[PDB]
Design a protein around this ligand. Sequence first.
Ligand SMILES: CN(C)c1ccc(S(=O)(=O)N[N+](=O)[O-])cc1
Ligand SMILES: CN(C)c1ccc(S(=O)(=O)N[N+](=O)[O-])cc1
Ligand SMILES: [Zn+2]
Length: 258
Amino acid sequence: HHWGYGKHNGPEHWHKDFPIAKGERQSPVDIDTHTAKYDPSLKPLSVSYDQATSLRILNNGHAFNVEFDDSQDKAVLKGGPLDGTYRLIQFHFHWGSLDGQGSEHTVDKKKYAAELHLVHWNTKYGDFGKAVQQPDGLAVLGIFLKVGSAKPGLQKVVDVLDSIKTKGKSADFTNFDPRGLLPESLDYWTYPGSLTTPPLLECVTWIVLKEPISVSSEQVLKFRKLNFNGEGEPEELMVDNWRPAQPLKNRQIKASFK
Ligand SMILES: CN(C)c1ccc(S(=O)(=O)N[N+](=O)[O-])cc1
Ligand SMILES: CN(C)c1ccc(S(=O)(=O)N[N+](=O)[O-])cc1
Ligand SMILES: [Zn+2]
């Protein structure tokens, strides 16, 4: 009886196995754009993805992860609210059963069709498993998806999904350039939070871009053909794999932009 996104194992149940679900710095949150304050002492983000080395794509039964070689500073996030160097390890998405839901963060209560998470770990902690035990261990760059024009840089991901339909399937996924998933502007909101899936560790500096990317209805429809189940088991479409907004508690959301 493991955690998931059903009625009987979804977000409202996670606190039983993971009591930090009710903690002081949980994610996602609603971003109230009129309450977020411009912080002129933030810097610009530095997203350095030119030497990124993608390796594999995995259906883990909750989402799919595009995994990177993180054994050197090949693809790193720095600047903005961050001190030091954060190495890209994987990205994944959260998405809905229909276009009006799917994002984890919300903006003035607006839900986007999906949300991309580029996960990075603080190299001062040496490995990812050590980093998740630290309050400044991870930096997640979150990017909203809206349905409209196709995103050309997403299509290589879309087309490999047929090969990883079910939980536990992987495929080689080399030479994928995550720069093709970025919007034009790097304006962002930032706040201290958590993983949005169990174990819900409070180790993340969230950096949520203001500008969504556009993907086509056909692209998101292909996400919705994935399965939560394993091969040879009854089909459960991988949709609505998002955690709703959590209480902001004693946090401030800061804006990089006026
Ligand atoms: C040789 N064939 C049949 C083949 C090759 C690649 C693809 S793909 O769309 O890049 N990947 N995929 O499906 O998972 C599909 C079919
Ligand atoms: C420790 N790793 C596995 C990890 C960290 C953070 C995330 S997330 O971007 O907060 N989304 N999510 O939790 O579902 C995902 C994975
Ligand atoms: Zn995520």
